[PDB]
């Protein structure tokens, strides 16, 4: 199995979740000023959005 | 019973669409109703309720992949103790 | 005003309720 | 103008004032972040196999 | 009848005779098919 | 430079749609044009290209 | 060998395999789409 890795270690990196984004206020996120995205968030009623 | 599976991907992409006869008074409002539900997220809630809510269906090695060798080892230690006590 | 709604029993889109014998009107479909 | 062959997004508000067509490509909102940063293995990575 | 709140699929031919709405769910054609302890001795 | 990444999944689903002003004669034929291109597979080829 | 240890896969593979049988609903967008198609596989 050590032989199988080698490459896997050389390239290890994680990811994120939109929930993990909403929880973190340290990371800053935004959208296009005038777009369907901003309007969809503005008109939304879901908890995360 | 989960006796079947999906293979590969989608040959074509399409969508289910409400229908009405030509010139219907319902056609104009149903479009606005669909868009409002899409924005509110209602369709996704219905999808989750009727699809996900009905759900009945390198990396290291794990004790499971090798547990058999552990079973043999302990069994052997036991057999050895038995043989020794028998001889004693 | 009342709408004639057409459908087919293609689950899970349309499927009859359990013991729908005691259901009357549109409630017999879920 | 008279037409918009653009990456314009459909929505309830714009339909109230203009007539859209059937979508020519499907999409969804998504999040964009800096690429990965593949990390180094780890002292004591010789136990990972 | 007067309306079809159904899993009806949009297509060019049916539009020529009736008016559809904006799709309420997306899909695509697809294919459906029928679906040890001592494993260290397998090699 | 491939120095950014998409993370997670799509919050909402929509589609890009050609637009025309109310009462335009182009609105009726553009719907049919889009459907014909989709069936023929032109849009798939453009997307791949 | 331990180190080494540690069906149809698409539509084209289905078209190639004549042994496996595939069918659709008699009256629906699927049958019409296949009938009106002009791609080689379909």
Short mmCIF file of C-alpha atoms in Angstrom, two decimals:
data_model
loop_
_atom_site.label_atom_id
_atom_site.label_comp_id
_atom_site.label_asym_id
_atom_site.label_seq_id
_atom_site.Cartn_x
_atom_site.Cartn_y
_atom_site.Cartn_z
CA UNK A 1 0.00 0.00 0.00
CA UNK A 2 2.97 2.32 0.53
CA UNK A 3 3.90 1.50 -3.02
CA UNK A 4 0.35 2.29 -4.10
CA UNK A 5 0.42 5.74 -2.52
CA UNK A 6 3.48 7.86 -3.12
CA UNK A 7 1.61 10.00 -5.70
CA UNK A 8 -1.48 10.35 -3.48
CA UNK A 9 0.60 11.99 -0.77
CA UNK A 10 2.44 14.31 -3.16
CA UNK A 11 -0.95 15.79 -4.09
CA UNK A 12 -3.26 16.16 -1.05
CA UNK A 13 -5.75 19.09 -0.84
CA UNK A 14 -9.33 19.44 0.61
CA UNK A 15 -12.47 21.48 -0.28
CA UNK A 16 -15.44 23.33 1.35
CA UNK A 17 -19.28 23.23 1.64
CA UNK A 18 -21.72 26.11 1.13
CA UNK A 19 -22.82 25.46 4.74
CA UNK A 20 -19.14 25.68 5.78
CA UNK A 21 -19.02 29.04 3.91
CA UNK A 22 -22.12 30.42 5.69
CA UNK A 23 -20.72 29.31 9.07
CA UNK A 24 -17.36 31.04 8.45
CA UNK A 25 -17.62 34.84 8.58
CA UNK A 26 -13.80 35.13 8.26
CA UNK A 27 -13.96 34.05 4.59
CA UNK A 28 -15.69 36.79 2.53
CA UNK A 29 -18.09 35.96 -0.33
CA UNK A 30 -20.00 38.11 -2.82
CA UNK A 31 -21.85 38.09 -6.17
CA UNK A 32 -22.29 40.19 -9.32
CA UNK A 33 -24.02 43.48 -8.40
CA UNK A 34 -26.91 43.19 -10.89
CA UNK A 35 -27.55 39.51 -11.66
CA UNK A 36 -30.10 36.72 -11.27
CA UNK A 37 -27.83 35.52 -8.43
CA UNK A 38 -28.20 38.67 -6.28
CA UNK A 39 -31.96 38.84 -6.96
CA UNK A 40 -32.40 35.12 -6.18
CA UNK A 41 -30.62 35.57 -2.83
CA UNK A 42 -32.59 38.78 -2.11
CA UNK A 43 -35.96 37.11 -2.83
CA UNK A 44 -35.02 33.84 -1.05
CA UNK A 45 -36.45 32.62 2.29
CA UNK A 46 -34.28 29.48 2.81
CA UNK A 47 -32.14 29.51 6.00
CA UNK A 48 -28.69 29.32 4.35
CA UNK A 49 -29.52 31.78 1.54
CA UNK B 1 -36.23 -4.08 -3.43
CA UNK B 2 -33.35 -2.12 -5.12
CA UNK B 3 -32.86 -4.88 -7.73
CA UNK B 4 -31.58 -2.64 -10.53
CA UNK B 5 -29.13 0.13 -11.34
CA UNK B 6 -28.54 3.14 -13.61
CA UNK B 7 -25.59 2.90 -16.02
CA UNK B 8 -23.65 5.69 -17.74
CA UNK B 9 -25.12 9.13 -18.20
CA UNK B 10 -27.98 10.94 -19.86
CA UNK B 11 -28.35 10.54 -23.64
CA UNK B 12 -30.42 13.76 -23.97
CA UNK B 13 -31.37 16.61 -21.60
CA UNK B 14 -35.01 17.72 -21.35
CA UNK B 15 -37.60 18.88 -18.82
CA UNK B 16 -41.12 18.03 -17.71
CA UNK B 17 -43.51 20.84 -18.63
CA UNK B 18 -47.09 21.58 -17.62
CA UNK B 19 -49.32 21.79 -20.71
CA UNK B 20 -52.49 23.67 -21.67
CA UNK B 21 -54.61 23.88 -24.87
CA UNK B 22 -53.96 26.71 -27.35
CA UNK B 23 -55.31 30.03 -25.98
CA UNK B 24 -55.89 28.77 -22.40
CA UNK B 25 -56.53 31.32 -19.62
CA UNK B 26 -54.51 29.00 -17.34
CA UNK B 27 -51.34 29.08 -19.52
CA UNK B 28 -50.27 32.62 -18.62
CA UNK B 29 -50.66 32.21 -14.81
CA UNK B 30 -49.17 28.67 -14.62
CA UNK B 31 -45.86 29.99 -15.99
CA UNK B 32 -45.73 32.65 -13.24
CA UNK B 33 -46.71 30.03 -10.63
CA UNK B 34 -43.87 27.74 -11.78
CA UNK B 35 -41.32 30.59 -11.68
CA UNK B 36 -42.48 31.64 -8.20
CA UNK B 37 -42.25 28.06 -6.88
CA UNK B 38 -38.77 27.68 -8.47
CA UNK B 39 -37.54 30.89 -6.78
CA UNK B 40 -39.06 29.90 -3.40
CA UNK B 41 -37.45 26.43 -3.67
CA UNK B 42 -40.76 24.55 -3.29
CA UNK B 43 -40.05 22.17 -6.19
CA UNK B 44 -36.78 21.12 -4.55
CA UNK B 45 -38.60 20.43 -1.25
CA UNK B 46 -41.19 18.26 -3.06
CA UNK B 47 -38.36 16.49 -4.94
CA UNK B 48 -36.51 15.74 -1.67
CA UNK B 49 -39.72 14.56 0.04
CA UNK B 50 -40.72 12.17 -2.78
CA UNK B 51 -37.21 10.96 -3.83
CA UNK B 52 -34.66 11.23 -0.99
CA UNK B 53 -37.22 10.65 1.81
CA UNK B 54 -38.09 7.26 0.22
CA UNK B 55 -34.41 6.25 0.19
CA UNK B 56 -33.98 2.56 1.03
CA UNK B 57 -30.83 2.63 -1.14
CA UNK B 58 -5.65 5.60 -2.37
CA UNK B 59 -7.03 4.70 1.08
CA UNK B 60 -5.40 2.67 3.86
CA UNK B 61 -6.58 -0.88 4.57
CA UNK B 62 -9.04 -1.46 7.43
CA UNK B 63 -9.25 -3.98 10.25
CA UNK B 64 -11.93 -5.46 8.11
CA UNK B 65 -9.66 -6.31 5.22
CA UNK B 66 -7.24 -8.18 7.49
CA UNK B 67 -9.28 -9.28 10.45
CA UNK B 68 -8.96 -12.86 9.28
CA UNK B 69 -5.26 -12.94 9.97
CA UNK B 70 -5.95 -11.67 13.49
CA UNK B 71 -8.50 -14.41 14.02
CA UNK B 72 -5.99 -17.06 12.98
CA UNK B 73 -3.35 -15.59 15.26
CA UNK B 74 -5.47 -15.65 18.37
CA UNK B 75 -6.76 -19.07 17.58
CA UNK B 76 -3.26 -20.31 17.23
CA UNK B 77 -2.14 -18.84 20.50
CA UNK B 78 -4.98 -20.71 22.08
CA UNK B 79 -4.17 -24.00 20.43
CA UNK B 80 -0.61 -23.61 21.59
CA UNK B 81 -1.59 -23.04 25.17
CA UNK B 82 -3.82 -26.09 24.99
CA UNK B 83 -1.06 -28.30 23.64
CA UNK B 84 1.33 -27.14 26.29
CA UNK B 85 -1.10 -27.73 29.12
CA UNK B 86 -1.94 -31.17 27.75
CA UNK B 87 1.73 -32.11 27.76
CA UNK B 88 2.20 -30.72 31.24
CA UNK C 1 -62.83 28.13 -13.36
CA UNK C 2 -62.52 24.53 -12.09
CA UNK C 3 -59.64 22.79 -13.88
CA UNK C 4 -59.89 19.39 -15.58
CA UNK C 5 -56.54 17.90 -14.51
CA UNK C 6 -55.12 14.98 -16.52
CA UNK C 7 -52.57 12.57 -15.05
CA UNK C 8 -51.25 9.00 -15.12
CA UNK C 9 -50.13 6.67 -12.31
CA UNK C 10 -46.37 7.04 -12.92
CA UNK C 11 -44.85 6.81 -9.44
CA UNK C 12 -43.82 8.75 -7.55
CA UNK C 13 -45.62 11.49 -9.52
CA UNK C 14 -49.11 9.96 -9.09
CA UNK C 15 -49.98 6.90 -6.95
CA UNK C 16 -53.16 5.93 -5.01
CA UNK C 17 -53.26 6.23 -1.21
CA UNK C 18 -53.33 3.14 1.01
CA UNK C 19 -56.95 2.20 1.87
CA UNK C 20 -58.16 4.94 -0.54
CA UNK C 21 -61.55 3.16 -0.42
CA UNK C 22 -62.35 5.53 2.50
CA UNK C 23 -60.92 8.56 0.63
CA UNK C 24 -63.30 10.70 -1.47
CA UNK C 25 -62.63 13.42 -4.06
CA UNK C 26 -59.04 14.27 -5.04
CA UNK C 27 -57.69 12.94 -1.71
CA UNK C 28 -57.58 9.36 -3.12
CA UNK C 29 -54.44 10.31 -5.11
CA UNK C 30 -51.01 11.05 -3.55
CA UNK D 1 -33.07 46.63 -29.34
CA UNK D 2 -35.24 43.65 -30.40
CA UNK D 3 -33.50 40.43 -29.16
CA UNK D 4 -30.87 39.11 -26.72
CA UNK D 5 -28.84 36.02 -27.80
CA UNK D 6 -26.82 36.20 -24.57
CA UNK D 7 -26.03 34.22 -21.39
CA UNK D 8 -29.14 35.87 -19.89
CA UNK D 9 -30.75 34.00 -16.98
CA UNK D 10 -34.50 33.30 -16.84
CA UNK D 11 -36.53 34.43 -13.81
CA UNK D 12 -40.09 35.34 -12.76
CA UNK D 13 -39.56 39.13 -12.77
CA UNK D 14 -38.08 39.38 -16.27
CA UNK D 15 -40.80 37.13 -17.75
CA UNK D 16 -43.47 39.53 -16.42
CA UNK D 17 -42.07 42.19 -18.79
CA UNK D 18 -40.45 40.22 -21.65
CA UNK D 19 -40.92 36.88 -23.40
CA UNK D 20 -38.19 34.27 -22.94
CA UNK D 21 -37.61 31.07 -24.91
CA UNK D 22 -36.95 27.50 -23.80
CA UNK D 23 -33.52 27.34 -22.10
CA UNK D 24 -30.63 26.48 -24.47
CA UNK D 25 -28.36 25.46 -21.59
CA UNK D 26 -29.01 24.49 -17.98
CA UNK D 27 -27.10 25.72 -14.94
CA UNK D 28 -27.15 26.41 -11.25
CA UNK D 29 -25.61 28.80 -8.75
CA UNK D 30 -22.21 27.65 -7.51
CA UNK D 31 -19.25 28.84 -5.42
CA UNK D 32 -15.81 29.85 -6.71
CA UNK D 33 -12.74 29.84 -4.45
CA UNK D 34 -8.97 29.99 -4.83
CA UNK D 35 -7.60 26.72 -6.34
CA UNK D 36 -6.29 23.98 -4.02
CA UNK D 37 -2.81 24.22 -2.35
CA UNK D 38 -1.79 20.50 -2.23
CA UNK D 39 -0.29 20.12 1.31
CA UNK D 40 2.88 18.25 2.32
CA UNK D 41 2.44 14.68 3.65
CA UNK D 42 3.17 15.02 7.38
CA UNK D 43 5.80 14.05 9.90
CA UNK D 44 4.59 10.57 10.89
CA UNK D 45 3.07 9.97 7.45
CA UNK D 46 4.96 6.72 7.31
CA UNK D 47 2.04 5.23 9.25
CA UNK D 48 -0.63 6.15 6.69
CA UNK D 49 -0.56 2.93 4.65
CA UNK E 1 -59.64 18.36 -20.40
CA UNK E 2 -57.99 21.79 -19.85
CA UNK E 3 -54.57 21.19 -18.20
CA UNK E 4 -51.94 18.51 -17.51
CA UNK E 5 -50.10 18.71 -14.15
CA UNK E 6 -48.25 15.52 -15.09
CA UNK E 7 -44.75 14.08 -15.73
CA UNK E 8 -45.30 15.17 -19.36
CA UNK E 9 -42.15 15.68 -21.44
CA UNK E 10 -41.73 18.72 -23.66
CA UNK E 11 -41.00 18.19 -27.35
CA UNK E 12 -41.26 20.07 -30.65
CA UNK E 13 -44.23 18.08 -32.00
CA UNK E 14 -46.49 18.55 -28.95
CA UNK E 15 -45.72 22.30 -28.79
CA UNK E 16 -46.99 22.68 -32.38
CA UNK E 17 -50.46 21.69 -31.11
CA UNK E 18 -50.48 22.70 -27.40
CA UNK E 19 -48.77 25.30 -25.19
CA UNK E 20 -46.26 24.12 -22.57
CA UNK E 21 -44.93 26.00 -19.52
CA UNK E 22 -41.43 26.52 -18.14
CA UNK E 23 -40.10 23.09 -17.08
CA UNK E 24 -40.65 22.34 -13.37
CA UNK E 25 -38.00 19.61 -13.27
CA UNK E 26 -35.08 18.65 -15.50
CA UNK E 27 -34.24 15.15 -16.69
CA UNK E 28 -32.53 13.08 -19.33
CA UNK E 29 -32.92 9.68 -20.96
CA UNK E 30 -30.99 6.97 -19.16
CA UNK E 31 -30.43 3.20 -19.14
CA UNK E 32 -31.70 0.74 -16.52
CA UNK E 33 -30.10 -2.69 -16.02
CA UNK E 34 -30.19 -5.50 -13.46
CA UNK E 35 -27.77 -4.99 -10.56
CA UNK E 36 -14.13 -12.27 2.94
CA UNK E 37 -12.57 -12.94 6.32
CA UNK E 38 -9.99 -15.18 4.66
CA UNK E 39 -9.41 -12.77 1.79
CA UNK E 40 -5.66 -12.52 2.32
CA UNK E 41 -5.37 -15.77 0.35
CA UNK E 42 -6.90 -14.25 -2.76
CA UNK E 43 -3.72 -13.12 -4.54
CA UNK F 1 -3.87 29.67 -15.19
CA UNK F 2 -6.24 27.15 -13.48
CA UNK F 3 -5.70 28.92 -10.13
CA UNK F 4 -9.30 28.60 -8.84
CA UNK F 5 -11.88 25.89 -8.28
CA UNK F 6 -15.60 25.22 -8.10
CA UNK F 7 -16.63 23.84 -4.71
CA UNK F 8 -19.68 21.86 -3.61
CA UNK F 9 -22.89 21.66 -5.61
CA UNK F 10 -25.54 23.87 -7.20
CA UNK F 11 -27.80 25.77 -4.77
CA UNK F 12 -30.58 26.38 -7.34
CA UNK F 13 -31.27 25.15 -10.90
CA UNK F 14 -32.06 27.45 -13.83
CA UNK F 15 -31.26 27.91 -17.51
CA UNK F 16 -30.12 30.58 -19.94
CA UNK F 17 -32.94 31.77 -22.16
CA UNK F 18 -33.09 33.88 -25.31
CA UNK F 19 -35.30 36.94 -24.79
CA UNK F 20 -37.48 39.18 -26.96
CA UNK F 21 -39.79 42.14 -26.15
CA UNK F 22 -43.54 41.56 -25.62
CA UNK F 23 -45.37 41.01 -28.94
CA UNK F 24 -42.24 40.36 -31.04
CA UNK F 25 -42.81 38.07 -34.05
CA UNK F 26 -39.36 36.52 -33.41
CA UNK F 27 -40.48 35.01 -30.07
CA UNK F 28 -42.55 32.21 -31.63
CA UNK F 29 -39.86 30.99 -34.09
CA UNK F 30 -36.90 31.32 -31.67
CA UNK F 31 -38.49 28.70 -29.37
CA UNK F 32 -38.74 26.29 -32.31
CA UNK F 33 -35.17 27.11 -33.41
CA UNK F 34 -33.84 26.30 -29.92
CA UNK F 35 -35.75 22.99 -29.75
CA UNK F 36 -34.61 22.01 -33.27
CA UNK F 37 -30.95 22.75 -32.44
CA UNK F 38 -31.23 20.78 -29.16
CA UNK F 39 -32.71 17.74 -30.95
CA UNK F 40 -30.14 17.88 -33.78
CA UNK F 41 -27.32 18.06 -31.19
CA UNK F 42 -25.83 21.37 -32.42
CA UNK F 43 -25.87 22.85 -28.89
CA UNK F 44 -23.96 19.81 -27.56
CA UNK F 45 -21.29 20.29 -30.26
CA UNK F 46 -21.01 24.03 -29.46
CA UNK F 47 -20.75 23.25 -25.72
CA UNK F 48 -18.00 20.66 -26.36
CA UNK F 49 -16.14 22.98 -28.76
CA UNK G 1 -0.21 -9.62 -7.03
CA UNK G 2 -1.44 -8.27 -3.70
CA UNK G 3 -0.04 -4.95 -4.75
CA UNK G 4 -1.89 -5.24 -8.01
CA UNK G 5 -5.16 -6.03 -6.21
CA UNK G 6 -4.89 -3.00 -3.92
CA UNK G 7 -20.94 -4.78 -18.31
CA UNK G 8 -22.07 -1.90 -20.58
CA UNK G 9 -20.40 1.39 -19.56
CA UNK G 10 -22.25 3.74 -21.99
CA UNK G 11 -24.80 3.90 -24.83
CA UNK G 12 -22.18 3.01 -27.47
CA UNK G 13 -21.26 -0.13 -25.50
CA UNK G 14 -25.01 -0.97 -25.48
CA UNK G 15 -25.40 -0.51 -29.26
CA UNK G 16 -22.31 -2.68 -29.88
CA UNK G 17 -23.72 -5.48 -27.65
CA UNK G 18 -26.52 -7.21 -29.57
CA UNK G 19 -26.71 -10.02 -26.95
CA UNK G 20 -28.23 -7.58 -24.43
CA UNK G 21 -31.82 -6.55 -25.29
CA UNK G 22 -33.07 -2.98 -24.69
CA UNK G 23 -36.52 -1.47 -25.14
CA UNK G 24 -38.68 1.58 -24.39
CA UNK G 25 -42.27 2.54 -23.60
CA UNK G 26 -44.47 2.04 -26.69
CA UNK G 27 -45.98 5.57 -26.79
CA UNK G 28 -43.81 8.32 -25.30
CA UNK G 29 -41.24 11.05 -25.97
CA UNK G 30 -38.58 8.31 -25.77
CA UNK G 31 -39.87 6.20 -28.70
CA UNK G 32 -40.56 9.34 -30.77
CA UNK G 33 -37.09 10.75 -29.96
CA UNK G 34 -35.42 7.52 -31.10
CA UNK G 35 -37.65 7.31 -34.20
CA UNK G 36 -36.97 10.93 -35.27
CA UNK G 37 -33.25 10.79 -34.36
CA UNK G 38 -30.51 11.12 -37.00
CA UNK G 39 -27.42 10.31 -34.84
CA UNK G 40 -25.76 6.99 -35.75
CA UNK G 41 -26.03 5.36 -32.30
CA UNK G 42 -29.71 6.22 -31.86
#
